[PDB]
Amino acid sequence: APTLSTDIEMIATTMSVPRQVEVTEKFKSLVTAHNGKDEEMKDVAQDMKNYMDEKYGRVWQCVILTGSYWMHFSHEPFLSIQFRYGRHICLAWRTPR
Amino acid sequence: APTLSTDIEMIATTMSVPRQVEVTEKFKSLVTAHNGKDEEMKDVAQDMKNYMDEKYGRVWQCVILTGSYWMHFSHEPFLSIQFRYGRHICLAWRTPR
Ligand SMILES: [Cl-]
Ligand SMILES: [Cl-]
Ligand SMILES: [Cl-]
Ligand SMILES: [Cl-]
Ligand SMILES: [Hg+2]
Ligand SMILES: [Hg+2]
Structure with missing residues (x-):
């Protein structure tokens, strides 16, 4: 804890669990x-x-x-980070500058 | 001509028609x-x-x-550039480096 919520499906991420939790919440x-x-x-x-x-x-x-x-x-x-909440898939990644 | 093919739906692009044609083809x-x-x-x-x-x-x-x-x-x-060919939507954009 803080733990990943049960209604998120993590699909793939190079971020830690604390970051996963903040992003998904x-x-x-x-x-x-x-x-x-x-x-x-x-x-x-x-x-x-x-x-x-x-x-x-x-x-x-x-x-x-x-x-x-x-x-x-x-x-x-x-x-x-890539995950699913209900019907929506969410993709996010960081590029330079 | 070269013209955008009839089976592509251009959704949005900041690229010219020559580039649109090469990318979509x-x-x-x-x-x-x-x-x-x-x-x-x-x-x-x-x-x-x-x-x-x-x-x-x-x-x-x-x-x-x-x-x-x-x-x-x-x-x-x-x-x-963003477009549709049949069932597939294709997104592409350029970032630094
Ligand atoms: Cl890849
Ligand atoms: Cl984001
Ligand atoms: Cl936007
Ligand atoms: Cl591409
Ligand atoms: Hg996102
Ligand atoms: Hg693409």
Whole structure:
């Protein structure tokens, strides 16, 4: 404890459990504040990106999605997190500057 | 001409039509070479990323997805392209280094 909540499925991350908990709990609070509406998920992606820049340094990208996904950023190591909360998959990783 | 093919839906891009055509035609050839299988879309994302680094400079990220999506990278301008071919949405944008 603090422990990863039971309604998050961690898919892949190079971040520690304390960071996983802050990131996922923040995402859940944002989605809840926006009543889970897809129509407002852009605000959520933006507020997640700003939260992460502030807290863990720039530059973050945030992708929220439904369905499946396949990605490539870099074979070299970089700060990253991928998880599922309900219907929404959340991707976030940090790039230079 | 070269013109954007009728089976691509451009969703948003800051790249010119010549670049749009090369990127989308390359994506279509890769998906066709992999028989459209979701199970191999990781190879496609990787080969798209390498094609784009080579052709337009580093560093590219590539996300292929089904379903909906909402993202944020940067309010500042950066090289980007988003489009749909059949069931697959393809996102790609360039970050520093
Ligand atoms: Cl993020
Ligand atoms: Cl990868
Ligand atoms: Cl790409
Ligand atoms: Cl945005
Ligand atoms: Hg995110
Ligand atoms: Hg792509």
